[PDB]
Write a protein that binds this ligand. Sequence first.
Ligand SMILES: CCCCCCCCCCCCCCCCCC(=O)OC[C@H](COP(=O)([O-])OCC(O)COP(=O)([O-])OC[C@@H](COC(=O)CCCCCCCCCCCCCCCCC)OC(=O)CCCCCCCCCCCCCCCCC)OC(=O)CCCCCCCCCCCCCCCCC
Ligand SMILES: CCCCCCCCCCCCCCCCC[C@@H](O)O[C@H](CO[C@H](O)CCCCCCCCCCCCCCC)COP(=O)(O)OCC[N+](C)(C)C
Ligand SMILES: CCCCCCCC/C=C\CCCCCCCC(=O)O[C@H](COC(=O)CCCCCCC/C=C/CCCCCCCC)COP(=O)(O)OCCN
Lengths: 459, 128, 603, 156, 178
Amino acid sequence: MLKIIIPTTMLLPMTWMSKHNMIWINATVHSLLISLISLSLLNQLGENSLNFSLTFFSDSLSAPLLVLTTWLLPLMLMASQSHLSKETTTRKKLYITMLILLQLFLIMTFTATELILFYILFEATLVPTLIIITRWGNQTERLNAGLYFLFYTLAGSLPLLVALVYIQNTTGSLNFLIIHYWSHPLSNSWSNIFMWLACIMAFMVKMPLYGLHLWLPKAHVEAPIAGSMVLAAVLLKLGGYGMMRITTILNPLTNYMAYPFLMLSMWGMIMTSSICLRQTDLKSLIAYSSVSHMALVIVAIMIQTPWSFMGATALMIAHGLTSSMLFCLANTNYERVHSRTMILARGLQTLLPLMATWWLVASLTNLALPPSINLIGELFIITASFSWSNITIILMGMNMMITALYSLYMLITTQRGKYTHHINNIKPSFTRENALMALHILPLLLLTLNPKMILGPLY
Amino acid sequence: SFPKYKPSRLATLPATLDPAEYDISPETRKAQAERLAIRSRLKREYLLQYNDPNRLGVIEDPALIRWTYARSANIYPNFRPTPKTSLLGALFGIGPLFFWYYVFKTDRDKKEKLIQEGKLDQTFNISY
Amino acid sequence: MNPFASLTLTTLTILTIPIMMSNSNIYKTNLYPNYVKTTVSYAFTLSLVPLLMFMHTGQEMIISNWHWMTLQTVELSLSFKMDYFSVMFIPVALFVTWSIMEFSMWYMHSDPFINRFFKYLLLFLITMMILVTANNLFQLFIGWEGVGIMSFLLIGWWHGRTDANTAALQAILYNRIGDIGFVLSMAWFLTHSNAWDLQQIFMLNNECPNMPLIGLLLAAAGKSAQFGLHPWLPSAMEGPTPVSALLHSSTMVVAGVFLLIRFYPLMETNKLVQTMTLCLGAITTLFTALCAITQNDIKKIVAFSTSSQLGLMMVTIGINQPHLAFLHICMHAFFKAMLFMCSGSIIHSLNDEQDIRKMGGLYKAMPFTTTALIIGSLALTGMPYLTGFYSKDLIIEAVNMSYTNAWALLMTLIATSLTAAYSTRIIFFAFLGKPRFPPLVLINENNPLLINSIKRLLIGSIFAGFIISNNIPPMTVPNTTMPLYMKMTALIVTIMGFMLALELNNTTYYLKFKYPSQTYKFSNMLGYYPSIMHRLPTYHNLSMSQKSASSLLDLIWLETILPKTTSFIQMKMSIMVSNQKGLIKLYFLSFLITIMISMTLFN
Amino acid sequence: HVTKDMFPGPYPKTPEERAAAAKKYNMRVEDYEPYPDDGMGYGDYPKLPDRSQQERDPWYDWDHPDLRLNWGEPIHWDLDMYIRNRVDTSPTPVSWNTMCKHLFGFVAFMLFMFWVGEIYPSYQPVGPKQYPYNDLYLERGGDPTKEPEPVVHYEI
Amino acid sequence: AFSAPAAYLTHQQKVLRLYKRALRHLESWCVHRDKYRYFACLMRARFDEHKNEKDMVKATQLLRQAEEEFWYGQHPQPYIFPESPGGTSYERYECYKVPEWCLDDWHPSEKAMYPDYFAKREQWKRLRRESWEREVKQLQEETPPGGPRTEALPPARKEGDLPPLWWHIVTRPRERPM
Ligand SMILES: CCCCCCCCCCCCCCCCCC(=O)OC[C@H](COP(=O)([O-])OCC(O)COP(=O)([O-])OC[C@@H](COC(=O)CCCCCCCCCCCCCCCCC)OC(=O)CCCCCCCCCCCCCCCCC)OC(=O)CCCCCCCCCCCCCCCCC
Ligand SMILES: CCCCCCCCCCCCCCCCC[C@@H](O)O[C@H](CO[C@H](O)CCCCCCCCCCCCCCC)COP(=O)(O)OCC[N+](C)(C)C
Ligand SMILES: CCCCCCCC/C=C\CCCCCCCC(=O)O[C@H](COC(=O)CCCCCCC/C=C/CCCCCCCC)COP(=O)(O)OCCN
């Protein structure tokens, strides 16, 4: 696993010793090379895992997340090149350093074989994100946003640490392989109930679960574009990966401890979706759509069936790519208009046709049009939920309809109709933006050809 | 005489059926005149900013900013916990959760009892 | 070896080459529409061969060529079902599409994005072929959603018009409501039959329960615009006339009836779902004919006619006659597409004017359109020995002699009368009077594209019923013996509808005027269904989406509970702890108190 | 460029701050009318008439012709609910209550008549259809090792 | 559309608007031309029987019962011209309208085509640049104090002057651009 970790670390001296005008070029080229190297992790077995050493191991659940993490960095660099033009060289290097440190922490977190190691890196991912949000954010709300993003997270994760050390004093190990092979049932007890809550709440708060999601709209609308990309595409999936890993020691308590969350998700996905129908901010709408998709992922993980896990993995990957693309499109509008209000810039299909095509493809993917992998994950989750209880279809069905509505709403308000008369500064789209959208959208349609790569270890 | 039109929330009253337009008073005419005056002032300001050759930027609209701010950020500082808000919040945020919990719990208890008694006929049910 | 499979796959494959060339140099020139039209004609000619093979022998095939993935015990592969339905529907769809493309080459001549328009039409045709030839439920869903997306894109062709965007979103909304039932059926079949493949579903379901069939019926009602989910089809007339003639007239809207036909082995084993289908179809056909009887836009009249015909197809499905419903689909394609082309010809010749109040004497002014529309109206009303005879007459006979609802039968007969009535209305108000269009007469039929495109479907709507009926194997027991009055019922009700409509239309010339009645207002405003149901639910949804979900819960109470309470309590405790005057008096008094407490409490 | 004092504020309680709010929203003090001082945080925002954007004049030269809005004029709290793509409140030729009564009556009558026709079906004066081999026992399901009770058909 | 609106409609304007609406809806009811001619002459006779009345109160009592009678018998599906706000081609060509300023963002290889057009465009731009500085002062001195009372604009009064705020009216895209 060090063949990926060491070059990512070498990105830092390469960034700092680079010329003043060559930081973006070198960073982009070497990040793309690291992504190409990390592509080799996709060769997985139907057997246990790729146990490289005592410290790191890879799975068909970890491999797609690692590939997505390594692929997101060049896109973030391209997206950040524009609005950081008038910034001093040292601060640009600091920005790139924050992005590299985030990538390193994520890489290690996904492959860590120890629960405590996983916790440490899972928390280490907070500092770069907080600095990025509160330093290079634009509005004055960013400070408050950062505070929320911090304390919510910590409020969930401090109990987990306690539980973790408690577990290691009882079983004697926190290694995931030993934990899986030596699993024992959890008896119905108040102590076991609180241990379950401590092990679950930290991952619930970062999905985010409905009712614990208030930090996400603030953080995503106040972050810079690269921060929004990494928050929506990768940092949300940390909770899903953690819950997928930790549910092996929580049975059979999950059979009845999952009821409050399942409801909170199944109703919650409705509410957030309906919230998207009445929203005046593009980024806020995209963030709430992320909340709805992650509620579906929460349901999938709590159901605890093979089809549920396959659908959850596929949906996590698909949502990461789609939400990153949508945030990039919204930002490409914002850098022209400087408003972030949906109804200001209108009728943009007439002025920017290719960007309108990108908007259409992104909206179609978010709408879960078959055979996209978004729909593959959604349909597998829906089938598993139907087996769990035939009534669930109702709520699931409703969500589907609502989703389409707001997706097309966002497409119709910004792209169709008449152009705004007084807005005369809408320049032709640059090659950088078009390439960014193409590099977002081509991997999705390529992945629909080999879905087994993103279906997780239960395929 | 003809059958009367009854306005509703989603089908409003026609302007030609308003008695208010037939009750003309000097004060009404003055109100209409000053409404037209303020509209004309706003139109003149916009059109002066709009036809200017030098300007090369989106024209800022204070009304739009006020609308977005009122819809988003002015909500909580003007919130006051009242019996109406407390009751509506409790209902709309708690009732659906317990309703769906009852429905799903009853369904799963029924299914579990049927499985335990063995009378469910799960033949060919291989994937779950 | 067995050219059947190669030919069937080659048709669908060569339908896709112009899509690949849409990035080449041909797409930037003015020869692209002719390229697409020629490709479709070649595909029709090629697809004519497997139909001949099936007609000679009865050749049937399943082609599972590409293995997509395997979820444990469930194998998903790209599979095509080349059965009677596929090899009979593909030539008809290709023929109609070729005619429509030739028509659009003339109709959309001044449109700047005509290449894009042609490309969009070909994409819809590809998706519809995928829908029709699918063998598993996932591929069928792919086609199902593809045709819906193409419908959204083609309805909102003029994206600067608010009404077009509204109509496109409306179509998406109703078809999503149907998609709910589609997904229900897929989940049920995966959970119980362990398959999405059609063969295993037929094997393992000897007595199909209610849930999957009700889901399928919901999907069919959504996509074929049955009474609950009907208004989107009349709203879809916002698109250009070729779109209305291709998608929302004869090819795309019969997809729900096709879905119910594909699952007919499971449908005949359920009596409740059959009755539900019968009642839904009967109410749909009656209501839509009643709405059509008072319309003034010609495209609206033809759209409501299409909806009533779809209701009649669902009635035919409900009485356990799926092959009759397929035959009706095939005949309706021909004559309804030609009727829409004639209407579009009139609209173009009258300077994009669609109201029948403003078209007068066109019987002599444009004779070819007149004859084509007369023949189409005669085929739609089931004139004997024409294309519509061989399906509509048999359907009426089958409904007459069957153990069914009396109300549904009565509604079907009344709907037949109303079909004759609105055909009379179109002819009378568009061709028979004195001219009522603006003085600058720009009437012109003399374009070979329009003439040839209309003429091919004219020959079709004259002879295709005879040819197809005589060339297919018998698939049902005939109704050989019948009471004489029961045998003539369709003709009798058609003649009565004709006569009553003509008599009522001839009184419009009298010099008397009166205000309308309540029944007329009900019929003109489409039973007030679009008003109420497009104002009461939507409002009550959107209002809630802002008042409760967004403001009360998310912005106020969820904020009140966790973060704001924490901030308030911590700040109050900070003020309590830090507000000390700095006087050692009170500090040392407190020290004394804690010393006493530690002395007398911890021992 | 908007100042701090130009933003929405709390509910106006005195006529002076009432008049101050009216000027801020570019409207007459006689026409200004805030939402009732309930719990929900409407605050200083003015309550405009609940008419839709579709019933605005289409022949006026609006600055935004598609939305039918003018620059600087106060925007209704629920503008995105009424954007001509959504719910409209335009007057109808027939009253709302009459339309509701007529539609509900038609639907209820059709349902009742379908149920009546279910109870009183239509059929032909014939007996059941006859099938030769024990009502096609072997061809319909099978079970060829049970020797079903033979059903013989009557020739008349 | 082109004319500035007033503060209110007088009684005469309201009566004439009713006359036009009633005739249009009567035409929608009477499809044939001779029937429409007969009933429109009858409606004209009915309309001017109170033409000579002097008092305002009853003249306003009329035109109220007239509005009620119109709304009762208003033909719920009246004929609309296709380009009118309710017509079948109202905003059909709205998507083909592109602003003039977009031409400023063309590539030089694109502007190399059509050199005469862009030379004329530069002439228009310089004319606008001078006329604007004149127009601002003209509007400043021609306006009453306290702001405009009506959104009507004055013409040019000097020799080389242009009407104030003329650019975005003269450079309209077109009725049918493509
Ligand atoms: C078993 C023996 C078999 C033999 C049976 C006898 C043979 C035939 C006998 C003839 C019987 C009647 C046929 C004539 C049709 C009526 C024509 C007529 O007079 O219309 C003018 C007249 C007034 O029109 P207008 O205001 O002067 O129009 C202004 C201009 O003319 C504007 O004009 P325009 O230029 O704009 O357009 C003209 C258009 C405009 O005209 C309209 O306004 C359309 C309305 C009339 C047509 C509706 C007929 C469909 C009936 C379906 C009903 C299903 C149940 C619905 C239940 C509703 C519940 C609320 O009219 C037409 O296009 C032609 C109308 C249809 C004639 C062609 C077909 C008629 C024969 C088919 C029916 C019978 C044969 C069936 C064959 C099977 C064998 C049984 O319409 C009526 O007064 C309606 C008469 C009948 C309606 C009954 C429904 C009343 C329900 C009230 C509520 C009752 C209590 C419910 C309580 C429920 C509690 C839950
Ligand atoms: C705010 C936004 C959402 C945040 C996330 C919310 C998710 C967290 C919800 C917690 C899950 C449930 C916790 C406990 C579930 C166990 C089942 C038990 O509660 O039900 C009955 C228990 O009865 C009563 O519940 C006893 C406890 C009553 C007191 C608890 C407080 C009730 C409401 C408090 C909600 C406050 C949540 C927020 C805190 C800040 C069963 O009866 P019994 O067979 O005897 O007990 C079985 C358990 N045994 C075997 C260990 C003995
Ligand atoms: C986003 C904000 C979320 C905040 C976190 C919510 C999760 C809270 C979970 C409980 C907190 C403490 C977890 C304990 C760590 C696990 C260790 C364990 O399980 O050991 C138990 C100990 O269990 C406990 O002691 C737990 C007691 C609870 C004390 C702390 C209360 C914290 C608040 C409780 C209510 C809130 C919990 C749900 C909150 C929902 C989200 C708001 C057994 O102890 P023994 O004595 O050794 O064995 C018994 C046989 N002799």
